[PDB]
Amino acid sequence: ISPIETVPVKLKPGMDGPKVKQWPLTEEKIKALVEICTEMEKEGKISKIGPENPYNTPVFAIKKKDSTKWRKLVDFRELNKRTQDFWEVQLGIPHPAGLKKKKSVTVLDVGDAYFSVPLDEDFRKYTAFTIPSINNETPGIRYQYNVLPQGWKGSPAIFQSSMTKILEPFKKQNPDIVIYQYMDDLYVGSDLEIGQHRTKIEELRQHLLRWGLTTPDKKHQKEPPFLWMGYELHPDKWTVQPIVLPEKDSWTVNDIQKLVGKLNWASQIYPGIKVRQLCKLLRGTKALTEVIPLTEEAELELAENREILKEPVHGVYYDPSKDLIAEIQKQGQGQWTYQIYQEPFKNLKTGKYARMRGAHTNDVKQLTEAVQKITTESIVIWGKTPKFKLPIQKETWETWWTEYWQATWIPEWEFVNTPPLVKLWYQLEKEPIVGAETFYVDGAGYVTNKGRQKVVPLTNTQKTELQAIYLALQDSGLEVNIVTDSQYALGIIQAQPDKSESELVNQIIEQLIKKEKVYLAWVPAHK
Amino acid sequence: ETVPVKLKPGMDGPKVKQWPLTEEKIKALVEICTEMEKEGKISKIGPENPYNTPVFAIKKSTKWRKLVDFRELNKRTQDFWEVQLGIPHPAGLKKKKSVTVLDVGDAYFSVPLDEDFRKYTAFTIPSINNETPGIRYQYNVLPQGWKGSPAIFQSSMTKILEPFKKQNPDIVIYQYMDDLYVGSDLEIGQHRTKIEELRQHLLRWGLTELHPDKWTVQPIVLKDSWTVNDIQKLVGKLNWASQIYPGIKVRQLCKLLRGTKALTEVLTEEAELELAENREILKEPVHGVYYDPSKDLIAEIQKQGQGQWTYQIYQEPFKNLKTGKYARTNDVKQLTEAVQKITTESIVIWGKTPKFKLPIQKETWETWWTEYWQATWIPEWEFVNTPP
């Protein structure tokens, strides 16, 4: 408390301190509030202030959780708005996969920490609250916060900085002990045997006590397994908390949102979770009371998902010496399940790469994006890119890489043999074919060097051109050379979408999946 | 004595977020920053300072170095500085025979910095798996890579380079963001000797090879077989270049196509003078393009494949100021080296460093530019690409 230094805090430039009027309260509320405030003043958390200070933040009395007693909550929206923006506390929880196995791990939750770390003298004035007096006889009793208030914008950042400053000398003196910190709690882990570990944790508690932060007793400390942010941290395995899917017959939009969230959360350890059809249902904006029927495809998806969730799965903590290995599998169209395992059949983390909504791309391009996403998440969690294992053949990758127009790279990878195998369905040639029927199209007919012609009744109202490009394929034969008036059709065909999202692309692909040589060129519109 | 440094009126400082980095890079950054703090160049900051600026570690040599991405703070200050304190650009550097970049980034680690401006230069070293909050820092000495550093150190640089420039009037020296450009029309060996002399000069005063003449604009070329496909290709390219050059017309060649025909054929109507003459209309470089001092340079990189990359620097579209063809290893590496060469040529020709329309995708460049970067400056690249 006393040794903990004060961080300079000031209001935003050009803004005055909060000034709010307190509304009258009930007689039991005011008596409970004055009792609690007097107890705090005895403890020194708050100090009475004179009438010269015009800053006031309203107070509200709420029944304590499962308690008839009326705890005190002070609103801080105004002062939060009028405060210098502090550095945000890190919003990403540590992933249990990146943790390294240690012989003993203890959970130390610092008690009443925001009331232990003090506050700046200049800023103490604005954090003033008034406890009203009945019958309007007196203005009331005023108080101010000598210590970090709760609900304030800067409480997490200031407390985190103070905790780091306090813990630094202990980390310097003992380097083996690793101390994670998330929210208030301190998570301590050492490779020492339990006999020395209990002594070291007692030493840490004494250090925090001499710096004024209370810690739980030895008996009260939790014992494994630990439940933390939906993760069940066993000694040698980590699993997600038991996930039960709703059996509700009629699903509302909010129910679908919860189901998709639970399935996505379960995907991190459970392999083979598919949520794409449910997300397709969810894309239509609707009221939370709106009831959307379950398509047969979505019902199949939910059936296979609930079948997958029936089995239990576990993950394994990271061991630094061995190298990470990541494997991608294409479960279906637009779904790619990726697994990250140091050793075979011991998965650190499973996941899925959902296809971009409303995007049709070549499966090799989707594979490249999945590889990039794996690289990013691996960097964030472990700090090293994995050695990938991908379905695509090296020759197919080289062909698409050299022909494609962007810059695409993939880290070190090898070829694992498994169905399905991702390959370019049609390799358009970039040179013409002699002795083949030269072919002209227009948005739809076939105008030919042989002399055949045709006409399509264009709707009075470009698809007919795509129809013509399709109509070109079946009319010509095995060896075809076509030219196109518009660049759009050439771009669509050159992107080589094996996605087969639309019916016209479907028929084009079905036609040219067997044609041995099809060369398309673009000839400008002739004036 | 500290000089007053002020942000442009009504603008807040940097608040950008750090992109997560590899464990080896984090370790190298931590050790470098700890050593610098012990020397006194950087000092710790608490949570009262929201401002942030990314940190990346590059390797130039087995010693890691730190590149601090000061693009936003530069946007907010160098504009204020350029009018207040500027660096002129010698026009003779482009005509010099040999030009050398000698890094003088160690000067700015001595002279102090304004107390009020110290807070806007804050950087964090990230941690793996969110184990601990990053060790935040601030710069107490002049930053490296911030365009106000040469402006502040200009007086010292002039007083340190005056004797050498007086001794050698032919040498042209120009400074841009921790880089000194030394140009000499002398032969290459004499240039090496002069650069060694300048390095010894700087070292004794407590201060610690591209060829511009060879560069020239790229010619553009535009059918004895008269293959109908080649005639279609020529009419397409001529219709494309119609915007760039007003002279070229493809009407007669269009008549040569004459509609429906078979693809492979062996024919010239009114001869083919048009092909030759339009080749002439192209051989002469574009006319009517002049540098505009108050506009941004944007460079488009186009991937022609086969280890080839064509770039076009242009103030206004369809009026190129310079066209080239870089010829080269992964595609990300090729793009990195292409960007570096393009902007170094831009620096030696005109003052500015171009904005880039990179062909690569956003997250891939974000992930893989740091490994292959080897230059102190950082251009304002645009990840998104226009399909070429």
Ligand SMILES: N#Cc1ccc2c(Oc3ccccc3OCCn3ccc(=S)[nH]c3=O)cccc2c1
């Ligand atoms: N509730 C809660 C809770 C408890 C401990 C956590 C945690 O502990 C470590 C702390 C420091 C180093 C390694 C750690 O963990 C290694 C792996 N590990 C994990 C568990 C067990 S019982 N044993 C073991 O070795 C790190 C992060 C979050 C934590 C949350």
